[PDB]
Design a protein around this ligand. Structure first.
Ligand SMILES: CC1(C)S[C@H]([C@H](NC(=O)[C@H](N)c2ccc(O)cc2)C(=O)O)N[C@H]1C(=O)O
Ligand SMILES: CC1(C)S[C@H]([C@H](NC(=O)[C@H](N)c2ccc(O)cc2)C(=O)O)N[C@H]1C(=O)O
Ligand SMILES: [Zn+2]
Ligand SMILES: [Zn+2]
Ligand SMILES: [Zn+2]
Ligand SMILES: [Zn+2]
Ligand SMILES: [Zn+2]
Lengths: 240, 240
């Protein structure tokens, strides 16, 4: 409802069960789910839903299996196309807590190989398939077959060592997950698993990988301008 | 000759210019090079040389180009066979400081894709080829072509997020690089770039990957028993 961390609801948001959905482009929506921590309040987390070529592609789970099943039910009601695959952007609960729900639904799942290696240690179910990356950060194409417009980029260690990012070709949208914070953020969030030496370069690498995108989507704020990238990088410069 | 950090010279060590070489098995030698730190003395770093029939394989550079050129000169004098390739075990100076000497010699160089992505940020030159890894840490074989007895394993983040390890097939030797400290060590060394949460599991994963290796080679101590692995993991348990 009214998160302690994460954006508030605004015009253009559709409530569906315990989740919120917002259309960002003709074929792209943002999903938002909430983890209610007793004595603290709710923490919102955002991911994406993309319609491409008669199928739906999901970026990130919700915090829980039940919330992720609700995402799939929203897709069934609003889009009514098969969900071909999901990409999850690192091995933490806000991005991978709902993997079992995707697997039960027959959806193929993909994550950075390192995310799958870390997953059990982080309390997560690993994805079924591992993405690997060139030294320049771009996904190795044979590991990401039939990805439609999704352009998957590993920017380097930052929020975690395994964090990946996703652009949507043909749109104005790029997704930074938990790496990118908004242009008005006062902190970089949870740095407990973070690489404070390399964070700034990784944020800048994300910006340079998706130079055209004007709508920067992220895990814990509303979509922002490219100022979110510059601000995240400058905040991260202070950690070195 | 007498490092402040690293093993001292014992019987069976051959001094060659500024470096020290020790035969570990009929076809395996340890190379040792020294970085003199002003007011502190020398820090030794160890890598390996492996003969595989009519060719030689190298694990890790020395600290500098000139020291690495001396490794190549020792190989020429003592073995007199071509170096087919080198594998470097993460993007820090002790393991990658001499890349330029390998390249000048025409030696094909390999590192974790992440090491190559970090190298420019660490003041290193990237290797010319990238290794990638499965979700259980084993190298993808197509990325390690014609590696002979070198069995490359990524154990998870520990000393750094990119650290890799190498078993020598057909021997009882496995190389832990800077991840593993000796059985008598009191500290884990430089933890500035370390993953303190995952270190213990990564050290144990290295041991489980090479369960019959009885001689554990590491960057800054003489070859040790498997107690190097178990003691490293025990110290790392304390970081969590
Ligand atoms: C919004 C954050 C500060 S929390 C989240 C994440 N942690 C969890 O998913 C944990 N499971 C968790 C545990 C307790 C709790 O109350 C809430 C979350 C992380 O550690 O990165 N991402 C962060 C970020 O993007 O900065
Ligand atoms: C033996 C260590 C403690 S230093 C080495 C490495 N650092 C360097 O290569 C740096 N270039 C460097 C900078 C200043 C200096 O005085 C010496 C070395 C690292 O940071 O991991 N590996 C460590 C380890 O294995 O624990
Ligand atoms: Zn996270
Ligand atoms: Zn987050
Ligand atoms: Zn963690
Ligand atoms: Zn190091
Ligand atoms: Zn070292």
């Amino acid at each position: 409802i009214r998160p302690t961390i994460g954006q508030q609801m605004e015009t253009g948001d559709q409530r569906f069960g315990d989740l919120v959905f917002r259309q960002l482009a003709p074929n792209v929506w943002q999903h938002t789910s909430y983890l209610d921590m007793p004595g603290f309040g709710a923490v919102a987390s955002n991911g994406l839903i993309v319609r491409d070529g008669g199928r739906v592609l999901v970026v990130d789970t919700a915090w829980t299996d039940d919330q992720t099943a609700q995402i799939l039910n929203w897709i069934k009601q609003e889009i009514n196309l098969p969900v071909a695959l999901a990409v999850v952007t690192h091995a933490h609960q806000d991005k991978m807590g709902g993997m079992d729900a995707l697997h039960a639904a027959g959806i193929a799942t993909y994550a950075n190989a390192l995310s799958n290696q870390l997953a059990p240690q982080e309390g997560m179910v690993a994805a079924q398939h591992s993405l690997t990356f060139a030294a320049n950060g771009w996904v190795e194409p044979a590991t990401a077959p039939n990805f439609g417009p999704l352009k998957v980029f590993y920017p380097g260690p930052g929020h975690t060592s395994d964090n990946i990012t996703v652009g949507i070709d043909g749109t104005d949208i790029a997704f930074g997950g938990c790496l990118i914070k908004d242009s008005k953020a006062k902190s970089l969030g949870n740095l407990g698993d973070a690489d404070t030496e390399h964070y700034a370069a990784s944020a800048r690498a994300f910006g340079a990988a998706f130079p055209k995108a004007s709508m920067i989507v992220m895990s814990h704020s509303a979509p922002d301008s490219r100022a979110a990238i510059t601000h995240t990088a400058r905040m991260a410069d202070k950690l070195r």
